[PDB]
Design a protein around this nucleic acid. Structure first.
Length: 432
DNA sequence: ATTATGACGCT
DNA sequence: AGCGTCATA
């Protein structure tokens, strides 16, 4: 009734750089632009592994986690860019620097939460308010929303044949209905957020050349969900009112954080398939199956409601260095293990120093992770030690000190079982 | 031999 | 503290 919270208190956006790694390589090498292309790392094993794919290439069925040799069978003209290799490993510096280009432009408009290298959440609530005062009850022209889609529209009543045609029909339906008289109507607020998102995205492309997609809604999960509805280079407005129809045929695994084991349990235990079917279960029922927190979250989420805040954080919380040693390449000697801990430590030191100079902070804890031959777990062991100095040899030495007793070998010089993964992460930052 | 990252929850 | 889940660069 009148006391039922509807979760329309915020305007939040999710922005995702389209095939980011690919765009970065294409900006630098015009020959790759507007072509089927992919970024790959390494080359020897089956042409190297693919980690990003242009949309031209996706139409051919090329995906990430695919071997380049195999992608070439689906798409013979596919162009490839290799990740830079340093110290015998993949180095992602070019893309991290590129990401900062984007994050710093986004920050001019609103407060952002860096989710990963290529996507961030935006809290547009206060921004929308300010804009709504300048508008002075003035209607919003469709011309201000040239790449916006309104989910669920158009509906009801011959140009409806092409994609752009449909987009505009929906947009006009949405705008014709808007009641601009009310400055507290959630739909008006979402709409103004979309205007701002258009502007943010224009600013990003003009100043970097990078294109992106975006979702606009009242919370992070709906925003994220919306972002993926119309790609590439488009944005989607998912209103609170669109939720029931949209969720009625939305597989549970499409909602963020339900794409794994918990989503599978939800589907198996409850005997449902779509997000909307969740509304038939009381909060208590949900809690009894999935715990108090997930239960409460699910109850609200299937109703389009979520309260997780956009955290004011533009910098990553950790800085890590990682390398897998698969199959026959696994590390089985001591000199081998130390040499790689040293290569990793040397990258880490280089990245931490620049981070201390750029961002006025120092990491204080070193996490060391390894994997042993046979364990299906990403990580077999995790030990942390103190990180007092940015010195590669010290960090590499301390890392060894905390793992050296994992060696089963009776011989000092050999290492068993062979290690299939080394990982050094700097964490626990402090002001400096 | 589905990388090399990143964020977060549980106990 | 050390382990596990979820997500795509």
């Amino acid at each position: 009734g009148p006391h039922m919270a509807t979760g329309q208190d915020r305007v939040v956006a999710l922005v995702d750089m389209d095939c980011f790694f690919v765009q970065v390589e294409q900006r630098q090498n015009p020959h790759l632009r507007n072509k089927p292309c992919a970024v790959v790392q390494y080359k020897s094993w089956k042409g190297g592994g693919i980690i990003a794919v242009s949309y031209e290439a996706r139409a051919f069925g090329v995906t990430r986690s695919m071997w380049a040799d195999d992608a070439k069978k689906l798409c013979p003209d596919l162009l490839l860019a290799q990740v830079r290799e340093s110290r015998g490993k993949a180095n992602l510096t070019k893309y991290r620097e590129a990401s900062v280009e984007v994050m710093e432009i986004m920050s001019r408009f609103a407060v952002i939460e860096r989710a990963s290298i290529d996507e961030a959440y935006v809290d547009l609530t206060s921004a929308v308010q300010e804009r709504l005062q300048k508008l002075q009850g003035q209607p919003i022209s469709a011309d201000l929303l040239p790449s916006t889609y309104i989910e669920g529209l158009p509906q009801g009543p011959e140009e409806t044949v092409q994609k752009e045609g449909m987009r505009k029909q929906g947009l006009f339906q949405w705008l014709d209905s808007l009641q601009i008289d009310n400055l507290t109507s959630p739909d008006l607020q979402l709409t103004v957020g979309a205007v701002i998102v258009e502007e943010m995205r224009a600013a990003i492309e003009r100043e970097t050349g990078f294109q992106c997609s975006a979702g606009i809604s009242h919370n992070k999960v709906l925003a994220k969900l919306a972002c993926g509805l119309n790609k590439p280079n488009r944005q989607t407005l998912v209103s609170h009112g669109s939720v029931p129809q949209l969720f009625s045929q939305m597989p549970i695994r499409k909602i963020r954080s339900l794409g794994g084991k918990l989503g599978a349990s939800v589907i198996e235990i409850l005997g449902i398939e779509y997000m909307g079917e969740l509304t038939q279960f009381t909060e208590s029922q949900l809690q009894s199956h999935f715990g108090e927190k997930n239960g409460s979250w699910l109850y609200a989420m299937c109703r389009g409601i979520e309260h997780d805040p956009v955290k004011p954080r533009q910098l990553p919380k950790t800085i890590g260095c990682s390398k897998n040693f698969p199959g026959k390449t696994a590390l089985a000697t001591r000199e081998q293990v130390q040499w790689w801990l040293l290569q990793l430590a040397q990258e880490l030191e280089e990245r931490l120093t620049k981070d201390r100079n750029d961002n006025d902070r120092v990491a204080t804890q070193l996490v060391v992770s390894i994997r042993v031959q046979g364990d299906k777990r990403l990580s077999s062991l995790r030990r942390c030690c103190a990180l007092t100095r940015y010195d590669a040899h010290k960090m590499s030495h301390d890392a060894f000190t905390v793992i050296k007793n994992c060696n089963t070998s009776g011989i000092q010089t050999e290492w068993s079982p062979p290690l299939t993964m080394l990982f050094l992460c700097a964490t626990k930052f402090s002001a400096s």
